[PDB]
From a paper:
The NADPH-dependent imine reductase from Ajellomyces dermatitidis (AdRedAm) catalyzes the reductive amination of certain ketones with amine donors supplied in an equimolar ratio. The two AdRedAm monomers associate to form a dimer in which reciprocal domain sharing results in the formation of a large active-site cleft between the N-terminal domain of one monomer and the C-terminal domain of its partner. One of them, AdRedAm from Ajellomyces dermatitidis, has been reported to be more stable than AspRedAm and thus perhaps more suitable for process applications.
The second form, which belongs to space group C21 and was refined to 1.73 Å resolution, has nine molecules (four and a half dimers) in the asymmetric unit, each complexed with NADP+. Variations were also readily observed amongst the four dimers present in the structure from data set 2, which was obtained from crystals that grew in space group C21 and featured nine molecules in the asymmetric unit. In this structure, once again, the vast majority of backbone atoms could be modelled in subunits A–I from, in some cases, the leucine and phenylalanine residues in the purification tag at positions −5 and −4 through to Lys288. The exception was chain H, in which electron density for Gly229–Gly232 was poor and could not be modelled. Despite the presence of the cofactor in all monomers, the difference in the conformation of some monomers was pronounced. In the most divergent examples, monomers E and I exhibited a hinge movement between the N-terminal and C-terminal domains of 14.8° as calculated using the DynDom server, with the hinge movement centred around the pendant aspartate residue Asp169. The overall effect of the hinge movement is to close the active site with respect to the cofactor, presumably to provide the hydrophobic environment that is required to favour greater stability of the transient imine intermediate.
Numbering used by the authors:
A (entry chain B): 1 to 288
B (entry chain A): 2 to 288
């Protein structure tokens, strides 16, 4: 292995995928896992198995941590508190913005540099260009390791505050859960009349959602300008579709629990006298 | 010089329908409760019917594009003998029940009846990306589908006259989920003073585009009643949820729009089915 050394801490599904990709691109790859047996498949394709946290940290300057949660990351760090000096830690362990900031503070106090990353991909997609990985933390630190990290996917630096990658990650997941709420309600409705989901989804729902997804750029601009529009696809107009959806759902025996919240928000805005505004107005309503 | 059509209702959508029929050479008779709305159509060749009865008499294909089912019934009931041996194509939005009720009246008055759901705004009428759902007797639809094809892409969804409306409302339900997601995502980034436009254009839209394609695999699982074991399990989703909730709380963002799916996921995990995937949620809201 002729390329710059990397150590990977955590050899679950994701850490295994990261280590595999580093090895495939010729990096000297040292691996560590709390349960040491998980290293064996990687040893078989050229990984070096570190017997301790301390020796994994010593083997490389770039130390990737991909464990379960922030508590587990802290447990790893605290096991060898002098091992991190002059190292760059890239923490790809999911958590809150606060978790990233707290971990960074510890790392900085122990002589390490620290970047947080959020992997927007499943393990199988690591190493593909479609795998987006968000990163945040000091720009100069990121600059030093971004070429090595680019083996994993498309690097997307989102700023200096170390908690920002996690915020972007969780924002994207929130978007996905809305999409899945819509899928669930739509498919329940057609399934309630014995319509197969696959044909409906492939030929009607996906094309419709694709068209409506493009509308989001205009909404985003309105959010930024704090100018929610007048007439058109107003909230007054949306509030006219809602009773049909609710009544049809009730008649088909489909619960409205997943869609009722946005309908209640729309109705609140109408009742405040702002029915002429559009959907961009809803963002400020859920903010503090 | 082409086959006659009558359009009842000259709002934004009815005007667009009449305009497209005229552009494709159909003799187009128009009627509206407020007669002034006919004047622009007269100027491009429409015949203005003085009564509902005379609009019905002018054509075999009678398109009704009004506000709601009550308004459709008001039009029909004004001239109860006018509809015999005519094909009514009702493009007025409502519930499946509304379409069935209207069809029952039409059939009792000697008419044939198709319901359609326009998944498009008026200016898109006549374009291939305008999908129009239709339901009702297949043999009736056969007789009018070539004329109707000038309006958009015909999508026949079956015999039960309420099915076009069910498909339409299902699609809208999907959209409202998408908008719930947009709202929460953008609130979160805005709470940290991140501009929405850059985030949406370069991160959220590409991500949602990729997740939208994943819906085909979920749909297959729903149909097979086989919700998977491991992978992107509900157990895995239930680990992201507390991070989203805690970060939202810290940023002062209400979780009212996403809490319901999190509660459904948690219920399924607690029933011992955490190894199943998101396709399991469809059956949970059915009953
Ligand atoms: N899988 C996925 O699709 C995605 C995962 N992620 C994130 O990547 C990270 C890793 O996920 P994934 O690999 O799939 O999860 P796995 O459950 O497969 O692996 C979790 C890893 O964390 C380790 N770990 C748990 N507790 C501790 C501890 N106290 N001290 C040290 N190590 C510990 C495990 O060690 P041991 O083997 O000894 O149990 C294992 O290496 C998580 O933050 C996850 O949210 C990000 C995007 C997608
Ligand atoms: N426009 C859109 O973006 C979309 C509309 N649709 C559906 O198409 C239909 C028409 O929409 P659109 O034209 O845009 O709406 P408008 O408000 O522009 O038009 C409503 C029409 O209904 C008529 N109407 C209202 N009440 C009655 C009544 N009691 N008797 C007779 N006619 C009546 C109005 O007549 P008058 O001029 O006298 O007021 C007008 O012609 C609705 O079902 C709508 O949901 C479907 C897809 C999207």
């Amino acid at each position: 292995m002729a390329n710059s050394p990397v150590s990977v801490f955590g050899l679950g599904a994701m850490g295994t995928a990261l280590a595999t990709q580093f090895l495939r691109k010729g990096h000297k790859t040292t691996v560590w896992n709390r349960t040491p047996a998980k290293a064996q498949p990687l040893i078989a394709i050229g990984a070096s198995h570190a017997p301790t946290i301390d020796s994994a940290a010593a083997a490389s300057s770039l130390l990737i941590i991909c464990q379960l949660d922030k508590a587990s990351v802290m447990q790893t760090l605290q096991q060898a508190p002098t091992a991190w000096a002059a190292k760059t830690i890239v923490d790809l362990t999911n958590g809150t913005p606060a978790h990233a900031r707290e971990t960074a503070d510890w790392a900085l106090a122990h002589g390490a540099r620290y970047i947080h990353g959020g992997i927007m991909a499943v393990p199988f997609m690591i190493g593909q260009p479609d795998a987006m990985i968000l990163y945040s933390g000091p720009a100069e630190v990121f600059e030093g390791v971004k070429d090595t990290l680019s083996v994993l996917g498309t690097n997307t630096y989102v700023g200096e505050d170390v908690g920002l990658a996690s915020l972007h990650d969780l924002a994207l997941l929130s978007g996905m859960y809305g999409l899945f709420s819509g899928f669930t309600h739509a498919v329940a409705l057609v399934q309630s009349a014995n319509i197969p989901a696959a044909g409906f989804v492939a030929t009607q729902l996906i094309p419709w959602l694709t068209a409506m997804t493009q509308h989001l750029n205009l909404l985003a601009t309105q959010v930024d300008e704090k100018d929610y529009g007048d007439g058109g696809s107003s909230l007054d107009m949306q509030a006219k579709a809602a009773p049909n959806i609710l009544e049809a759902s009730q008649a088909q025996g489909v619960s409205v629990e997943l869609i009722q919240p946005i309908f209640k928000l729309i109705e609140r805005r109408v009742e405040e006298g702002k029915g002429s505004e559009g959907l961009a107005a809803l963002v400020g309503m859920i903010m503090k």
